[PDB]
């Protein structure tokens, strides 16, 4: 997958080389285009989960960066759902299995920071994570998909 | 029973709901949600109060959707339903029957959690039905 012209094109929308230069309108329009495109590639493959996670992470990022004040609940609910689904699509296959292992060991295994496991537990069972906890965890998850997927996307 | 809960019931579920504007209705919802947020900071607040606040937050976002990408309203609504169900329930289907929680909520929680994100229409149906449920089983008996 990491070589296809389709994912290489998506990488340039989600992670423009251009980025500091580009206007935020243009930036968001490129993000939005990539999100629409992802709906097009929908497999039960690890890559598909990364693409869909990336789409919703940037959906949450724009909502977080656009927050102008007032009630913060909808943006925290949006970001929290995104993080849960991101973690779950990476961890569910083992955790939902007949031979599940402790999530901390399972996260250590795919190099997923424990903060994401803790975030998921809070958003699932406890107080909804705060605005800044959501912003930090959406930022770090974008870092993660980049480190573990997008960085390696290139034409051969 | 408490004055605060009696006041909140009139903001979430006003009498004049038939004859009131979206703006007026939504300003009262936001007042109620900010009040809950305020109670929750200081003191212990019930799950039904917290979920009612987020449910109306999700409802407003759903009704205000006007086109374009629907992902954020669906993510918002899905997280609200998951927490609503989790606070009530944590064999889920069996537990839900015991408390008269429709099975559709367990199925929604599962999809949002583990599979495809539910559709805009599934989100609206669920939020509507969850607001009906907290009325039937909590708010209706406050007076």
Residue numbers in the entry:
A (entry chain A): 10 to 165
B (entry chain B): 12 to 101, 111 to 163
Q: Any passages from the paper?
A:
After screening a large number of crystallization conditions, we successfully obtained well-ordered crystals of the CjLas1 HEPN domain and determined its structure at 1.80 Å resolution using molecular replacement method. The crystallographic asymmetric unit contained three Las1 HEPN molecules (HEPN1, HEPN2, and HEPN3), each of which assumes an all α-helical fold. Analysis of crystal packing and interactions across HEPN-HEPN interfaces suggests that the biological unit of Las1 HEPN domain may contain a homodimer and a monomer. HEPN1 and HEPN2 molecules form a face-to-face dimer related through the preudo-twofold axis, similar to the HEPN dimer in the Las1-Grc3 tetramer structure. Secondly, the catalytic residues in HEPN1 and HEPN2 domains are close to each other to form a compact active center, whereas the catalytic residues in HEPN3 and its symmetry-related molecule remain far apart, presenting two separate catalytic sites. We compared the HEPN domain dimer structures in CjLas1 and CjLas1-Grc3 complex by superposition and observed that significant conformational changes occur in HEPN domains upon Grc3 binding. Remarkably, large conformational changes are observed in the catalytic pocket. In the Grc3-free Las1 structure, the catalytic residues Arg129, His130, and His134 within one HEPN domain are far from the catalytic residues in the other HEPN domain, while in the Grc3-bound structure, the catalytic residues within two HEPN domains are close to each other. These observations indicate that the Grc3 binding not only stabilizes the Las1 HEPN dimer, but also promotes the formation of a more compact catalytic pocket, showing better catalytic activity for specific cleavage of ITS2.
A HEPN (higher eukaryote and prokaryote nucleotide binding) nuclease Las1 and a polynucleotide kinase Grc3 assemble into a tetramerase responsible for rRNA maturation. Las1 and Grc3 are highly conserved proteins and have recently been identified as core enzymes involved in processing and removing ITS2 spacer, which is a key step in the synthesis of 60S ribosomal subunit. Recent studies have demonstrated that Las1 is an endoribonuclease that contains a HEPN (higher eukaryote and prokaryote nucleotide binding) domain responsible for rRNA processing. Grc3 is a polynucleotide kinase responsible not only for Las1 nuclease activation, but also for nonspecific phosphorylation of the 5′-OH of the 26S pre-rRNA produced by Las1 cleavage, providing a signal for further processing by Rat1-Rai1 exonuclease.
